[PDB]
Amino acid sequence: EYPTVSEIPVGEVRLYQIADGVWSHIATQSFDGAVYPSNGLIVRDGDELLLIDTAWGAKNTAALLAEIEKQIGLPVTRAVSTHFHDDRVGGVDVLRAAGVATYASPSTRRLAEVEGNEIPTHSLEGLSSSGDAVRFGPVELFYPGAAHSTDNLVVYVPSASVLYGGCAIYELSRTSAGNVADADLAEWPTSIERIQQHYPEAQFVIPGHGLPGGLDLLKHTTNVVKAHTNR
């Protein structure tokens, strides 16, 4: 039932209900002549919605808001980007124009600015040191340490035991490292272990790209990152 690339024409977006009041959003982009899927999260926040991550670009993110209106019909009032790369901040300007309040850590905002990427409006305090967590509406935001990027956040939905790892967590089908240009390979397993330590009760774990699974995605990622380290 989870959608894959061949289900999703580029420019379209699918929603997937994970639990009561919790969805992923799935979109695709072409990169170097291959097509990659990308996940984000949507969490019901009373009669409003919280969005985690853009749908990887302006057109996708417009389509995302259109699909949310079509299928859920509650207002997206806030969005949080989990790190500074384009699959996470690309589309922030579309969200902002549509009246969504955009958020990221000050580390992410700064790195987005350096990269010339779109920059969320608001700055999330309380996430500066590895192991820091803050509640943000119906989710907990956690900074595990540097991993895929120095700023990467993960998002937990306590009502549903859903853990969204973003790009710090790989899907099982990914056997070799993704983009590690901005990674801290040295710290990435230590960061993954902080996630395990903080969220041992998680039932559904959503990678930045590809299929959900369970907490097995954590050690899977560590194995892949450690192999890449020793390449």
- Residues of this chain that bind Zn ion (CB under 5 A): 85, 87, 167, 208
State the residue number with the nearest CB to Zn ion: 167
Query: Cα dist. 30→38, 57, 80 in Å?
Result: 11, 11, 24
Q: Which residues contact 229 (CB under 8 A, 6 or more apart)?
A: 185, 186
Residue 47 assigned as binding residue? yes
Give min distance, CB of 88 to Zn ion, in A: 7
Residue 184 assigned as binding residue? no
83 as an active site residue: the answer is yes
**Catalytic one among 83, 117, 151, 152?**
83
Of 53, 126, 62, 73, whose CA–CA distance to 98 is shortest? 62
Give min distance, CB of 123 to Zn ion, in A: 20
C-alpha 163/C-alpha 221 separation (Å) is 15
C-alpha 85/C-alpha 149 separation (Å) is 9
179 as an active site residue: the answer is yes
Q: Considering beta carbons, is residue 85 or 220 the nearer one to Zn ion? A: 85
Q: Which residues are catalytic?
A: 83, 85, 87, 148, 179
Which parts are annotated binding residues for Zn(2+)?
A: 47, 83, 85, 87, 122, 148, 167, 209, 220
